[PDB]
Amino acid sequence: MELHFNLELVETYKSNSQKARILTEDWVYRQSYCPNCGNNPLNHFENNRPVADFYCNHCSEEFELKSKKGNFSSTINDGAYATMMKRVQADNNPNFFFLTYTKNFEVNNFLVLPKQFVTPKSIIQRKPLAPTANRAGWIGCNIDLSQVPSKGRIFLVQDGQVRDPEKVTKEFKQGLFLRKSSLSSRGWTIEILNCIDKIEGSEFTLEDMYRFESDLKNIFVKNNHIKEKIRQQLQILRDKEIIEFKGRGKYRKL
DNA sequence: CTGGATCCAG
DNA sequence: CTGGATCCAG
DNA sequence: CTGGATCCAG
DNA sequence: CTGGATCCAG
Ligand SMILES: [Ca+2]
Ligand code: NA
Ligand SMILES: [Zn+2]
């Protein structure tokens, strides 16, 4: 990845907001890949499409890009409130890219946030624009990401440095199982991913997994069928291309 | 027209 | 954190 | 929807 | 039997 914008694109513009739109969307089109499946390039939706900047034409994941000069805040500016409210609840609800760029118009940080982390609760309605305003009565919104987990933020470029796309695809696919709250309970798929990651190396077996039985039992005290559950969860992780089934109780991390 | 889109600016 | 000024398109 | 339980190919 | 597939309850 190269980290600088194509400044020529914005010669004819005056608004720094509109310049940011052009420069950041061009950069992502030219330089980013699908953090879910690894497809490059992402495809750009048509202009004005609500909360819909890019799609991956391989896996159908959608992406909303939010960009800013400087540093991230937990509060993010957006578009129309009503259509945000509708898009976060859609079956094809978008994942969210966050991009920071420097005073030299180069990409400082670039991360993805899995889609489950932007919920209707996150979306804060703004006061309508005054009737003095050009867009009088427009109701915009801000997104409150304060509650998002540290681990939900998956960096593609971090403080100047491009990260390995395979580390990112791995982390994103794990991230899609991550729970909206620290207060929400354990969750099987998460706890099993946790065991998998405690196993050294790429290859493992069902017997390796059944060693975590006593540990899983403490967590899920009412589960009297732990082994069956381990097996069911491995099937879930397979269907998501997180592991491969080698046949008869043998697995490999992807 | 109306109603989406940008994030900047302070 | 809050309120706008640009842009874009059916 | 997800946690707990059941089924049966091989 | 063993491990992948499926069902049922709240
Ligand atoms: Ca955007
Ligand atoms: Na957009
Ligand atoms: Zn993809």
Residue numbers in the entry: 1 to 254
Reported in the publication:
We present a crystal form of R.DpnI with one molecule of the enzyme and two target DNA duplexes in the asymmetric unit. One oligoduplex is bound to the winged helix domain as previously reported. The other duplex binds to the catalytic domain in a conformation that is posed for cleavage. However, the relative domain orientations differ drastically between the two structures [according to the DynDom server the change can be described as a 75°–80° rotation]. The catalytic region of R.DpnI is disordered in the absence of the substrate, but folds upon DNA binding and forms a standard PD-(D/E)XK active site with two binding sites for divalent cations. Based on the anomalous X-ray diffraction signal, we suspect that one of the sites (site 1) is nearly fully occupied by a Ca2+ ion, while the other site (site 2) may be occupied by a mixture of Ca2+ and Na+ ions. The site 1 Ca2+ ion is hexacoordinated by the side chains of Asp53 (the ‘bridging’ ligand) and Glu64, as well as by the main chain carbonyl oxygen atom of Leu65, the proS (OP2) non-bridging oxygen of the ‘scissile’ phosphate, and two water molecules. A three-stranded antiparallel β-sheet with a long loop (residues 75-80 and 123-144) wedges into the major groove of the target DNA. The hydrophobic pocket is formed by Leu129, Arg135 and Trp138, which are all located in the long loop that gets ordered upon DNA binding. It simultaneously interacts with both methyl groups: its pyrrole ring is in van der Waals contact with the m6A of the proximal DNA strand and its benzene ring with the m6A of the distal strand.
The prototypical m6A-dependent endonuclease R.DpnI was originally isolated from Streptococcus pneumoniae. The biological activity is due to the specificity of R.DpnI for Dam-methylated (Gm6ATC) sites. R.DpnI cleaves its target sequence with high efficiency if both DNA strands are methylated and with lesser efficiency if only one strand is modified. We have shown that the enzyme is a type IIE restriction endonuclease and consists of an N-terminal catalytic domain of the PD-(D/E)XK type (residues 1-182) and a C-terminal winged helix domain (residues 183-254).
